[PDB]
């Protein structure tokens, strides 16, 4: 009862809003979006700001608010920061990836602001009895 908390399993499809699979071309080395999360199997990555000149920005079919589920077969679903950053930082200019991401969650509290264990509380969350 009182399920007013963010649901979790790994399921892209549990995730609400819009589930999209969009290709981001590794442009200018890496991507060009800042993403918060991916700390544990329990914590997924989420876009907190799309960096202008980023392939998300550019492709326009990915926006701040997409939650990063997986990418180019790689199970980045609950990927550890060190691991996810390793992939995302090592990529070359001119490459391609298929982003499996789910958007619909509006960016509420700033995950840009440290000094706290960052758990942003999202609206448009199910406040079910």
């Amino acid at each position: 009862g009182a399920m007013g908390k963010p649901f979790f399993t790994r399921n892209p499809s549990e995730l609400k809003g819009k589930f999209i699979h969009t290709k981001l071309r590794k442009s200018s080395r890496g991507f060009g979006f800042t993403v918060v999360g991916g700390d544990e199997p329990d914590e997924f990555l989420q876009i907190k700001s799309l960096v202008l000149d980023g392939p998300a920005a550019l492709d326009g079919k990915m926006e701040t608010g997409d939650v990063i589920v997986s990418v180019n077969d790689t199970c980045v679903l609950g990927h550890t920061h060190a691991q996810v950053v390793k992939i995302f930082q090592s990529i070359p200019i001119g490459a391609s990836v298929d982003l499996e991401l789910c958007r619909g969650y509006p960016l509420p509290f700033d995950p840009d602001d440290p000094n706290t264990s960052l758990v942003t509380s999202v609206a448009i969350l199910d406040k079910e009895p």
Binding site: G32, G37, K48, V119
Partner: peptide, 11 residues
């Protein structure tokens, strides 16, 4: 120590 904190991965 802390677990629930989403990390800034600027890519």
């Amino acid at each position: 120590r802390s677990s629930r904190t989403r990390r800034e991965t600027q890519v």
